[PDB]
A and B are shown apart, each in its own frame.
Chain A
Amino acid sequence: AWITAPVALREGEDLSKKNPIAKIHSDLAEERGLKITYKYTGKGITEPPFGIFVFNKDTGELNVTSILDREETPFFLLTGYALDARGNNVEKPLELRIKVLDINDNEPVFT
């Protein structure tokens, strides 16, 4: 794969002001005469930690539910997807990556 850019989130603040922090989008109506449904998976949404990100099945917009720390949760890897109104493959998937942005809130400790 490729080193594609992250969406960022900074430590300890309430991150629900950015939601939805990303979205997928596509359309099928003029090439295929169909409408659409959207999906995500990955770390935060189908691998641990769990329940971090949420999205509506109609829209493709992705939200973050938790207050974060790069000292706890350094990086996240998701993939979006989209299907037609009966469940069919139609559009290529891509990854999406999220980071935690880090400020000095802690003191160095031995190994």
Chain B
Amino acid sequence: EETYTFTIFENCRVGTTVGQVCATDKDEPDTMHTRLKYSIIGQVPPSPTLFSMHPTTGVITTTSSQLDRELIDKYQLKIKVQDMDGQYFGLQTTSTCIINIDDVNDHLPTFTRTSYVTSVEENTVDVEILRVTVEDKDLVNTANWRANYTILKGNENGNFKIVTDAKTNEGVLCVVKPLNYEEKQQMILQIGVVNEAPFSREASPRSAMSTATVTVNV
């Protein structure tokens, strides 16, 4: 190819494979002047070195300690292939490799506040009672930055729903089935937020999930 293009995850282990580059010669084979030798000849950013390439098969693997989507998203390298085993009078040819970085769900939805107090009238539906919000440092609009909420406590007979207002990821709490002041005057609640995306390293079950305390007055 004129230009090779690959895509790797962020914050995966060093030594991960990028992709392979492939070239050929039309001289007589098993000679020296067909013996191929491949290389990186430059990076953006210029230093330090983040990738390495296999000299006799053209396979690129990662050599930095980290490649992190939430700071850098792309790396364009200049690459070359030489015959003669890379002896000084072999013939050589320059080309380009683009590496992309792909966002994993490494970051959490993060509160600026975790306790909240509200009131509502009895008998009422289609009224909202509490909004909550989050940052997530994953990339906008992706499944990794999108939000989902849950009512964890205090909704015994089904008065409450939580839904997401997408444009800011704001979790909107509403009464779906009415209260009755002639049964209860106060209740205490818990909610929670997590991504639409899965999480790793045993985070799925609760530790990806963040919670807020709620009180509702009738």
Contacts and interface: CB of A to CB of B under 8 A. Distances in A.
Contact of A86 (B14, B15, B48, B65): B48
B119 interface: no
A58 interface: yes
A43 B133 CA distance: 55
Interface string B119-140: 0000000000000000000000
Interface residues of B, number: 7
B66 to A, nearest CB: 9
A85 B14 contact: no
B48 A57 contact: no
Contacts, number: 11
A40 to B, nearest CB: 13
B50 to A, nearest CB: 12
Interface residues of A, number: 6
Interface residues of chain A: helix, strand, loop or mixed (majority): loop
A87 B65 CA distance: 13
Interface string A68-87: 00000000000000000111
Given A57-B15, A57-B63, 4 more contacts: A37-B65, A85-B48, A86-B47, A87-B49
Interface of A: 37, 57-58, 85-87
11 contacts: A37-B65, A57-B14, A57-B15, A57-B63, A57-B65, A58-B65, A85-B48, A86-B47, A86-B48, A86-B49, A87-B49
Interface of B: 14-15, 47-49, 63, 65
